[PDB]
From Swiss-Prot, chains A, B:
Span within the parent record: 139 to 217 of 353
Superkingdom per UniProt: Eukaryota
Upper taxonomic lineage: Eukaryota, Metazoa, Chordata, Craniata, Vertebrata
Gene: DND1
Free-text function comment from the UniProt entry: RNA-binding factor that positively regulates gene expression by prohibiting miRNA-mediated gene suppression. Relieves miRNA repression in germline cells. Prohibits the function of several miRNAs by blocking the accessibility of target mRNAs. Sequence-specific RNA-binding factor that binds specifically to U-rich regions (URRs) in the 3' untranslated region (3'-UTR) of several mRNAs. Does not bind to miRNAs. May play a role during primordial germ cell (PGC) survival. However, does not seem to be essential for PGC migration.
Localization annotation: Nucleus; Cytoplasm
Protein name as annotated: Dead end protein homolog 1
Domain called RRM: residue spans: 12-85
Subunit structure: Interacts with APOBEC3.
Length: 89, 89
């Protein structure tokens, strides 16, 4: 209704982030999603469980789809609770 | 003993990765650690619990330290078990 049409698949929804995660801590963690990330909105997550949802708007569909893949791959393989990162002595 | 001195802090240890995670699945998930990543070795993790350790060798200390920060920030904030990523409708 008057608004420019939104480009399709340029914005990700990331739901169930930590309840007290700060905007600056989120943007530090999202840095590797690359220079395509334009804006971030952080709200309380809908539903019974505490959390936040982040709305991540990219400058292209290509930047957004790269970011979506990256997040999903990290989530499905690097999120082990006993994963430990250190300098190799 | 004959070997060129290793550069200091150019190699990360990532311990406690999933036991059956493949080399190709690890390298797909590590893609955002950026073009500094040169070589990856994947072994069984030492100790009582199942896992793998990945030895990640970077072309500079700058590439390695960026990669270490990125992994640690992702781990401490994006690893929630109910984190859900979708296209914003």
């Amino acid at each position: 209704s008057g608004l420019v049409p939104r480009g399709s698949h340029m914005e990700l929804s990331v739901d169930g982030l930590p309840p007290n995660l700060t905007r600056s801590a989120l943007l530090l963690a999202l840095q590797p999603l690359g220079p395509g990330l334009q804006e971030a909105r952080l709200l309380p997550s809908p539903g019974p469980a505490p959390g936040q949802i982040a709305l991540l708007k990219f400058s292209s569909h290509r930047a957004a789809a790269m970011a979506k893949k990256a997040l999903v791959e990290g989530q499905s393989h690097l999120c082990g609770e006993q994963v430990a990162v250190e300098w190799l002595k």
